[PDB]
Structures are given as C-alpha cells and as structure tokens.
Design an enzyme around this catalytic site. Structure first.
Site, PDB file in Angstrom:
ATOM      1  NE  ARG A   9      27.544  35.994  34.612  1.00  0.00           N
ATOM      2  CZ  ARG A   9      26.265  36.285  34.891  1.00  0.00           C
ATOM      3  NH1 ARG A   9      25.387  36.488  33.918  1.00  0.00           N
ATOM      4  NH2 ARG A   9      25.849  36.344  36.150  1.00  0.00           N
ATOM      5  CG  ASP A  21      31.083  33.407  39.722  1.00  0.00           C
ATOM      6  OD1 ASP A  21      30.073  33.789  39.104  1.00  0.00           O
ATOM      7  OD2 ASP A  21      31.477  32.181  39.784  1.00  0.00           O
ATOM      8  CB  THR A  22      30.630  35.788  45.201  1.00  0.00           C
ATOM      9  OG1 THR A  22      31.749  36.598  45.141  1.00  0.00           O
ATOM     10  CG2 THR A  22      31.114  34.291  45.307  1.00  0.00           C
ATOM     11  CB  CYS A  70      34.275  35.129  52.325  1.00  0.00           C
ATOM     12  SG  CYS A  70      34.576  36.286  50.976  1.00  0.00           S
ATOM     13  CG  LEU A  71      40.861  35.724  52.747  1.00  0.00           C
ATOM     14  CD1 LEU A  71      41.796  35.211  51.692  1.00  0.00           C
ATOM     15  CD2 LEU A  71      41.673  36.390  53.850  1.00  0.00           C
ATOM     16  N   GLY A  72      37.097  38.118  51.658  1.00  0.00           N
ATOM     17  CA  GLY A  72      36.379  39.311  51.121  1.00  0.00           C
ATOM     18  C   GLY A  72      35.147  39.732  51.853  1.00  0.00           C
TER      19      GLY A  72
END
Ligand code: HEM
Ligand code: FES
Lengths: 106, 401
Positions: free
Chosen positions: B173, B238-239, B344-346
């Site tokens: 951002r 960010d996500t 997504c790994l997360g």
C-alpha cells in the site's frame, strides 16, 4: 463412516468421515500428518498418496486420467493399489476402508 | 489508456475492464468485479487496459486454466507484464522443491501447533482495544496480528515490527516515498544478515528452517532462502490484512449475521468459508506458453490471461444468489486461495487466523459499527483491499474475558 489410516511405522489412526469428504481432507483436518495434501485436492501435487487395502479396491471408484498422470510423480514406491486420496470421496459404501500411508510424500 | 487491439483478438470479445480502476468501485470491490459476470459478457474477454490481456470470467474456466500449467505458465503471473519472490513464478517440477520447504514452516502441523499462541496474540490485541470504544481495524488489528505471527514463527524481535510494517506497507500500500524495488531491496537488506547468521548458527525458527533446507538435493542458497522468506512475509500480510478488513466491514453492517455467530460460535468455521467466498480478493494470472484454443477462443503464445481467484465463488453458476452471505450454505464453492499446484501455501494458517479472529473478537466486542461519517474506501488490483476501517462500540456492551 470409518476410515483407518496406517502409517509406514504401523501407527494406526481411525476417523469418522462424513459422506462427500475426501480421505485427504479428513487426514489433513485431524492430524494425520503423513498425508500432506499440498495442492488442496485437485490431483495437482502427489502429496496425498496412499495404498488402498486390497479388501476395498473394488469398492473404490477408479482413478481418472488426471489422477493417473499425477500418480506417475509419487516419490514413494508406486504400487498397483496406489491412489491420490484427495480423489477418494467418502461414502457409506466405504465404511471400514483401510489405507496405508507411504513412507514419504515429498 | 487502451492498447491497440491485436488483430488475433475478435472485436466482439472486447470488454475494457481495468483491474486497477474498475467502474463503480464505490458499490464495493467484489461488486465492481462482478460486472464481468453479467449475462451478456462472454466467459472469456479481452481488455485493452493494462497492456492488453485476456480475462476468464467464470469459475469453470478459471479452474481448468489453473489445472494446466503446460499451456498457462506462472512465469509471468502478474498484469501488467512489468518482483522475484519464490515460488510465485515457478512451474512444477521445480516449484515442488520450494513447496516442500515452505510446508516445513507454515504447513498444517505448524498451524495446529501454533493455535494457542495465535489465540493469545488475538486476545491481547483485542483486550488492548476493547476499553477505547474505537479503532481503525485495518491498522490496529488486521496488520499487527499477522505480522506478530510472522515474528513469532521467524524468531524475530518485537522491536523490528515498525521497520517491517513500513517496508511491507511500501511494497503493497505505497504512500509514495519508495518504489516497489527500493522497498524490496530494503526488505532484503534486513533479511540477508539474519539468514547468514542462521546458516552459521541455526535455531529452530522458520528462517533457520528455510535457510538450512535442501532443494534439488543440495543445500538451499542464501539468495533462494531470502526470496522464499520475503514471500512468506508479504504473502501472509497483504491478503490477511485486507481479507480481515472486508470481513469485519461486513459484520459491522450486518447485525443478524453477527448475532448468528455470537449465539452459535460453532458456526464460525463455516462462516469463515462463506466469508472467504464472498469477500475473495486476489486476481493474478498466467502466460500462454503456446498458441492454444480454449473454449472457442484462440489464444496466442505470450498473451497474458487474468484468472481472477475472486470470481469463481461469485459466479452464480457455482453458488446461487452469490452476492448473498449465507453461513448455512450447503456447499461453499470458491477458489479464494487459488487452484492447482500454486494453491496458497498459507491456506491453513489463513483459515486459523480468520477463525480465531472472529471467535475472539465477538466474545469480547459483540456489537460494533462503522464510525459515523465514515465511508469505507476500497482499492482494486492484484490484491484488492480496504484503505482503513474505523469501527466504534460502546465499551459498556463489551466484556473482558
Ligand atoms: C485470506 C488470506 C489469503 C489468501 C486469500 C491467499 C490467496 C493466495 C492465492 C490466490 C495464491 C495463489 C496465487 C497463484 O496461483 O498465483 C497464494 C499463494 C501463496 N500464499 Fe496466500 N493467501 C492468503 C494467506 C496467506 C498466508 C497467511 C500466507 C502465509 C505464509 C500465504 C502465503 C502464500 C504463499 C507462500 C504463496 C505462494 C504459493 C505458490 O506460488 O506455490 N498466503 N495465496
Ligand atoms: S492433495 Fe494434491 S493430488 Fe491430492
């Protein structure tokens, strides 16, 4: 329905899995850490490899071409009863299914 | 500004959506993007914005494209064509090396192990806010939570949070001092000495584990470890920041939905899935490795295609009344975390962050709303988001556990 997961070192685990839930999803949500499920269940990784017990192989729907293709990349020994357990969807028909988890996924 | 239409692109497929500046962004981000799913818009469109690229508008096409890296490569995953991090830009088989290493640090076993720590972090933050009767959720919770999780996993001291917030904020951002490349170089400047220190003297933190790991049968290089660690930080920031903000924005406006979860906290996991679908926020894509016909459209080698994760769950073909939030939906269909080998790994970590956030917040601050006079500003892009989220509550309606 009951699903039994036997590790390479003989560790046994048993889960009560809802109809429609894959054997990968159940393993990953209940601490069966020798199934990784890296891709989230689209036959895109080979880290949900299991050996389906020979008493259950004709109850389980056949692998599709995408799964057969991905099964060529498994790192453990590929055996006739090798499956990607994200492709195995629990049904009352499969009550008691035993799967052996291989000695590696990565 | 509109790139000239390549002559291989049919004129009747042109729909000039700008993913960085979509019309009717004041109706909401997901509403702005859902213009791509009105009944007269084709399944596969070309926009002349941002250099010119394809966009798949329907879940079925998004999933199929993500399942075929042979034709749809990650080598160029972002639009516009003009960022190294690993393994974002790698296809299998090489990508698998880095998935295996990342799983050692953010995999389900680590996430199960960390659950109590994550709950404690959330409770401490929320208890600090509770008596004040207000906060900017985005800054006061949504960013501190995941960054503190990272510092915990990575064995990094609390005193470094401000610096890392600043650089990660410039990356994602931007307030406009630093370019993306400057901010990334500064992040690398911070990580490099830590990685070198933890190769010389390893601990059991996530940087030690990544930095002493193996890829391709040999020890990971310091530079590979740096690029992996940078993504494990920015990828969970960010996500999560923006997703938590979207969700709390919705709950602030929706008293019956809030009440459902206050009265039936057992429904939170289901709610998390349904918020993941409704407030999906990522849109990346792929590059054509060869000429290929897809769903009756001829794609050209080198064409980029946007495959917006956001859109699959908003597709009325995948979920009836898709703009409605229904925590009791029988099947929540989405691709919020992506699909295929880059899913997504997360994903496990993200779900636990969302579930813990909702459980711990609603138990202490059950009733809250958007600050009077505020109008929540949104941004659209690769990760769409919320600029700020001023919330207020009456501290007399709260409870300290
Ligand atoms: C709500 C939260 C999150 C969402 C919606 C989300 C979404 C996504 C998406 C859609 C991708 C795939 C992009 C593509 O295919 O190119 C991705 C990749 C990734 N995510 Fe997340 N993510 C979230 C949270 C996290 C967290 C908590 C981490 C923590 C480490 C994380 C780390 C990553 C990594 C490392 C990748 C790269 C995977 C690869 O390319 O193989 N994400 N994420
Ligand atoms: S979870 Fe990836 S192939 Fe089964």
């Amino acid at each position: 329905s009951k699903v039994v997961y036997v590790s390479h070192d003989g560790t046994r685990r048993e889960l009560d899995v809802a109809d429609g839930v894959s054997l990968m999803q159940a393993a990953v949500s209940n601490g069966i850490y020798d199934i990784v499920g890296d891709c989230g269940g689209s036959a895109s990784c080979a880290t949900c490899h299991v050996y389906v017990n020979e008493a259950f192989t004709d109850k389980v729907p056949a692998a599709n071409e995408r799964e057969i293709g991905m099964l060529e990349c498994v790192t453990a020994e590929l055996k006739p009863n090798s499956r990607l357990c994200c492709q195995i969807i629990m049904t009352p028909e499969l009550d008691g299914i035993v799967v052996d988890v291989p000695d590696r996924q990565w | 500004n509109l790139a000239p239409l390549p002559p291989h692109v049919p004129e009747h497929l042109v729909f000039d959506f700008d993913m960085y500046n979509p019309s009717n962004l004041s109706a909401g981000v997901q509403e702005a993007w859902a213009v791509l799913q009105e009944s007269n818009v084709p399944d596969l469109v070309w926009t002349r914005c941002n250099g010119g690229h394809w966009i798949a508008t329907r879940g079925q096409l998004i999933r199929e494209a993500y399942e075929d890296y042979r034709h749809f490569s990650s080598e160029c995953p972002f639009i516009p064509r003009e960022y190294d991090f690993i393994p974002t830009s790698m296809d299998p088989p090489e990508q698998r090396q880095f998935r295996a290493l990342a799983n050692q640090v953010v995999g389900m076993p680590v996430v199960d192990c960390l659950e109590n720590c994550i709950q404690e972090l959330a409770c401490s933050l929320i208890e600090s806010l509770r008596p004040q009767g207000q906060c900017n959720f985005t800054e006061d919770y949504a960013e501190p939570f995941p960054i503190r999780i990272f510092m915990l996993l990575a064995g990094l001291p609390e005193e470094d949070i401000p610096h890392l917030k600043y650089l990660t904020d410039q990356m994602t951002r931007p307030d406009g001092s630093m370019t993306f490349a400057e901010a990334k170089e500064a992040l690398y400047d911070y990580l490099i000495p830590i990685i070198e220190q933890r190769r010389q003297k390893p601990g059991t933190d996530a940087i030690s584990i990544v930095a002493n790991g193996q890829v391709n049968g040999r020890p990971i290089t310091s530079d590979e470890a740096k690029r992996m660690c940078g993504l494990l930080l920015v990828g969970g920031l960010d996500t999560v920041v923006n997703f938590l903000s979207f969700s709390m924005e919705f709950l602030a406006k929706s008293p019956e939905h809030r009440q459902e979860l206050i009265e039936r906290p057992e429904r939170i996991p289901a709610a998390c899935e349904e918020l993941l679908r409704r407030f999906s926020l990522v849109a990346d894509g792929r590059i054509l490795t060869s000429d290929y016909e897809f769903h009756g459209v001829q794609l050209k080698k080198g064409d980029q295609i946007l495959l917006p994760q956001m859109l699959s769950g908003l597709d009325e073909r995948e979920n009836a009344a898709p703009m409605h939030v229904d925590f009791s939906r029988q099947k929540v269909s989405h691709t919020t975390f992506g699909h295929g080998s880059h899913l997504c790994l997360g994903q496990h970590l993200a779900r636990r962050e969302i579930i813990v956030t909702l459980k711990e917040w609603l138990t202490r601050i059950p009733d809250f709303s958007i600050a009077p006079g505020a109008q929540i500003q949104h941004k659209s892009g690769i990760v769409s988001g919320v600029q700020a989220l001023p919330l207020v509550w009456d501290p007399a309606t709260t409870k300290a556990v």
